[PDB]
């Protein structure tokens, strides 16, 4: 029930405090398979899976700061986090896209080009993920918009096996209303911005469905096992 301005600031702060921006980071690169496409580069996969584990921890920290999220049953908090895991991780890595070099930057500064993202584990998802990063760029979204989009993605009453889906639908409504007033207030000259941002949630769900298929094939390909926190989210 908070006022729109209060909800926006809470969500903006939840995202900013769990997501360093590309400008804040000390970018660095690696020579590992930078110019050769391979099925799986194990050194990149080891680094990528470690950074993904860290991003999951930051995603849970973000969710716990969203108003009313911790009031849902623990079973529903878990169902929501599992279902939105890939959506939020993909939105986050795509937020750090540099188009001139066609790279994405991780939360420690590691900057990978398209071939290296392919080799790290993206595989067949690579072009869809980079296409999404390119669609996001002209929107010029800020921390409040990215945080609200992540929150709308997470607090979704249509996820399978929710105990209280109508409660989740009710919690999402104020987030959608807040994004609408914020986007219009911030940029009144662009009246089509809000529906364009909502369409990114649909694109993202399609990519995350393909991502769940990729987890299956990667499980057969990696030499060891998936890290425990990744397994909890995706299996």
């Amino acid at each position: 029930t908070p006022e729109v301005g209060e909800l926006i600031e809470k969500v903006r702060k939840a995202h900013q405090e769990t997501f360093p921006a590309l400008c804040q980071l000390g970018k660095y690169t690696t020579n590992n398979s930078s110019e050769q496409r391979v099925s799986l580069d194990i050194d990149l996969w080891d680094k990528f899976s470690e950074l993904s584990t860290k991003c999951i921890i930051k995603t849970v920290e973000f969710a716990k700061q969203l108003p009313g999220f911790t009031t849902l049953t623990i079973a529903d908090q878990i169902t929501l986090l599992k279902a939105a895991c890939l959506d939020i991780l993909i939105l986050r890595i795509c937020t750090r896209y540099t188009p001139e070099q066609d790279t994405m930057t991780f939360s420690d500064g590691l900057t990978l080009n398209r071939t290296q993202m392919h080799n790290a584990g993206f595989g067949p998802l690579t072009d869809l993920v980079f296409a999404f990063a390119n669609q996001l760029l002209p929107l010029e979204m800020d921390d409040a918009e990215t945080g609200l989009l992540s929150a709308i993605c997470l607090i979704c009453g249509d996820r399978q096996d929710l105990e209280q889906p109508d409660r989740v639908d009710m919690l999402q409504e104020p987030l959608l209303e807040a994004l609408k007033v914020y986007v219009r207030k911030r940029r009144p000259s662009r009246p089509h911005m809000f529906p364009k941002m909502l369409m990114k949630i649909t694109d993202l769900r399609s990519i995350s469905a393909k991502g769940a298929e990729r987890v299956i094939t990667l499980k057969m390909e990696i030499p060891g096992s998936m890290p425990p926190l990744i397994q909890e989210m995706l299996e």
């Binding site: 921890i57 849970v60 716990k64 908090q77 878990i78 986090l81 425990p228 909890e232 989210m233």
Partner: peptide, 10 residues
Amino acid sequence: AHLILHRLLA
């Protein structure tokens, strides 16, 4: 069991 998740959430 979602052991780690339970820990992060509680």
